[PDB]
From Swiss-Prot, chains A, B:
One of its GO terms (molecular function) is protein homodimerization activity. Optimum pH is 7.0. GO terms for biological process: vitamin B6 catabolic process. Belongs to the AB hydrolase superfamily. It catalyses: 2-(acetamidomethylene)succinate + 2 H2O + H(+) = succinate semialdehyde + acetate + NH4(+) + CO2. Keywords: Chloride, Hydrolase. Its EC number is 3.5.1.29. Homodimer. The active site is at S96, D120, H248. Pathway: Cofactor degradation; B6 vitamer degradation. The keyword Transferase does not apply. This is 2-(acetamidomethylene)succinate hydrolase. It is an enzyme of class 3 (hydrolase).
Amino acid sequence: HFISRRVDIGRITLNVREKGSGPLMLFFHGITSNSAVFEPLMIRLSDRFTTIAVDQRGHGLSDKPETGYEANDYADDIAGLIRTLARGHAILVGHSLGARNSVTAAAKYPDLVRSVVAIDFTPYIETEALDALEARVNAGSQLFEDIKAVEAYLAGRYPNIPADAIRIRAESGYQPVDGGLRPLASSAAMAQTARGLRSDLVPAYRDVTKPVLIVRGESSKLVSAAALAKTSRLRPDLPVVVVPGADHYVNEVSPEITLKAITNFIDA
Amino acid sequence: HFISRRVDIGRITLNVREKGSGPLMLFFHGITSNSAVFEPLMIRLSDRFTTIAVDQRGHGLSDKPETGYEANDYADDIAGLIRTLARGHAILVGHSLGARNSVTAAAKYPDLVRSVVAIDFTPYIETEALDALEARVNAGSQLFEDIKAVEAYLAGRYPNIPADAIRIRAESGYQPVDGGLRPLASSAAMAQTARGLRSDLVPAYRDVTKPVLIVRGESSKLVSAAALAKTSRLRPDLPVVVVPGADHYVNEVSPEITLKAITNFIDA
Ligand SMILES: [Cl-]
Ligand SMILES: [Cl-]
């Protein structure tokens, strides 16, 4: 149902998945992931919005520059893409890396973005949590024998993610290479992106003038309850949603509640 | 520049304050209060919304029937007001009694209401808290020498409410009588309304299908943090806003954060 195409936005070329019609709504995945993880959620909003998932730089079928993996880099990519699509301001739905990127974009390009749904990535994340993300970020950079081996690997790295979601990641983020399957994501891009995630995100949340819904997973190991509390104290006006039973991977682990939270937000 | 008028909705006649143009946005006050407390907030949304604050049954300059002060009665009034106004579904922004009435209405009349901003009134409010409220409301029915005495009394009863807001309550809630001033609100209505606020509100929050923004004051004595925590597990999808340095009287104590929270919600 979704058509894939690489879009030249000038500064770089990105791969995207499109479907539906109506106001623009862009989806941005987390580190090492890719645009496909959002198809289940998009089909649900396609009749009312033009849903487009974006493989961000260094990931999926998008360009993989030698460098430039900081917040600003990803943020400028978003502005470029919104301008290139020229379909009006966009609602940004981002998960982790995507969430950090969307809020940075919204704060720097007020006019290009209508609102943001920041799923599991706020300022104040503790060093230990980022140490963990950084240590296993390229644990996937290896040669898998077949798709079965990819799923085994994924199911083990993301124990709470549903088999269906595991299969989607397995089929979309790994391609047949000499001798087996390998990640589409560039290892150098990941390493640089991971340490870029340590930068101060306070200015971005403090200065964003557009609506931002903060979504946290109850048992998320990336965004702690203490981190969300400080964020809310920084911006008490930003609506908050805490998803029960969900860890860092909110949209994949709790698809229904995630959907309802988004529709409650944009339809109000 | 507000225009006040008594609107006959059939089942009863209510007084309302109107200003601005655009999508309909209705405001509902707390028990013993009246529509005037919202003027400062409405002034801020008049430019793009047709803002209308309502003196609910038994309050202000509205009809004060002898009986009928349960949630259903207050909720059916809201339905009639939206039908009589004939201007499309309305956004419901209610405080305490008003919030309780608004969610109730949303659950019962989904097509008449676009969304709801429920300020400080969730289910699970503990008994002792409802007892204290009831005690204060009934003790409010007394004679005051003059407006100065009224202002002193209200200030002592609501220590955190800013003087300008206290004055508004003093100038709008009373009537000249022999001996000085007395509340406009019907005492019988208040007693009955206070009692009705004890009814189970889980049903309404559980079945409401339209967007609802839950707003709590960090130090509210009516809506405890536990009550909010329980409300969020009942409906984890409903966005939440907790206002630091604000008690039960959120919109009057923290007007800026309140306005901002409202716009982040409806403009998403
Ligand atoms: Cl990430
Ligand atoms: Cl009340």
